[PDB]
């Protein structure tokens, strides 16, 4: 998964 805390 992407993850809930990934940002960009």
């Amino acid at each position, epitope marked *: *998964a*992407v*993850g*809930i*805390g*990934a940002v*960009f």
Partner: antibody, heavy 118, light 113 residues
Framework: QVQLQQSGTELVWPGTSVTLSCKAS????????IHWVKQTPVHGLEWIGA????????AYNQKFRGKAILTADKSSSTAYMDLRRLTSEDSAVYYC???????????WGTGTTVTVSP | DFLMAQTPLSLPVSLGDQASISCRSS???????????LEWYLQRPGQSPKLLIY???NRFSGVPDRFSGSGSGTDFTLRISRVEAEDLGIYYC?????????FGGGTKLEIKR
């Protein structure tokens, strides 16, 4: 050994609350998110929510909002899930699993059985 | 809301035959980096779920080459070219692009007679 060590079977009375623990071992706890999954015969697998140990940030499946509370303890490398006001619908096997951003659930705990009964 | 419709619910097969499991998303699950985070897990009786495929087509290390996956957009398929006794269990697709993440309803792979 890279592992997630889950707490033992919970036999609990209806209306009570319970704390489930997921202890990370053999890797860096704060490098991965912790995700919780509920498993039942009727609903299959359900994504409960997740926590980011580094920031304490959480996200929930709205169906579990108010039912589940996720925390992460950096110093003990342990993730916790409180399940609140238990009913028979909460009887299930609960898994924790880890996630590095953009990868996948490679390592899973062996699951905690929760049995709700008076 | 990025629900996964997984079919069929149960798939009776003979060992050695081919198996095909399908998962359809209500809307596109392509993530903003261009990747689609669509995974397939297997859960056998008494065991934890186990990762098979990630990013629609990629085999997790150790997974036999009998397993493959394909699709794009809203339509995804897991294929087992030849089913073996160790493959029996419940397969779940999993949508990891958009929160809340969601599982398909499961496909129980069983022996036909």
């Amino acid at each position: 050994q890279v592992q997630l060590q889950q707490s033992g079977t919970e036999l609990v009375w209806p209306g009570t609350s319970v704390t489930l623990s997921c202890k990370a071992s053999g890797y860096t706890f704060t490098d991965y998110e912790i995700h919780w999954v509920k498993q039942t015969p009727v609903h299959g697998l359900e994504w409960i929510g997740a926590i980011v140990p580094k920031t304490g940030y959480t996200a929930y499946n709205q169906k579990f909002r108010g039912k589940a509370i996720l925390t992460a303890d950096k110093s003990s490398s342990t993730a916790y899930m409180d399940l609140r006001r238990l009913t028979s619908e909460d009887s299930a096997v609960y898994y924790c699993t880890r996630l590095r951003n953009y990868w996948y659930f490679d390592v899973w705990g062996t699951g905690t059985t929760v049995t709700v009964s008076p | 809301d990025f629900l996964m419709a997984q079919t069929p619910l149960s798939l009776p097969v003979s060992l050695g035959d081919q198996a095909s499991i399908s998962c359809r998303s209500s809307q596109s699950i392509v993530y903003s980096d261009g990747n689609t985070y669509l995974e397939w897990y297997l859960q056998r009786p008494g065991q934890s779920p186990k990762l098979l495929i990630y990013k629609v087509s990629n085999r997790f290390s150790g997974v036999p080459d009998r397993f493959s996956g394909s699709g794009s957009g809203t339509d995804f398929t897991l294929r087992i070219s030849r089913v073996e006794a160790e493959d029996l269990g419940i397969y779940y697709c999993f949508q990891g692009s958009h929160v809340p993440y969601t599982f398909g309803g499961g496909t129980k792979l069983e022996i036909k007679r």
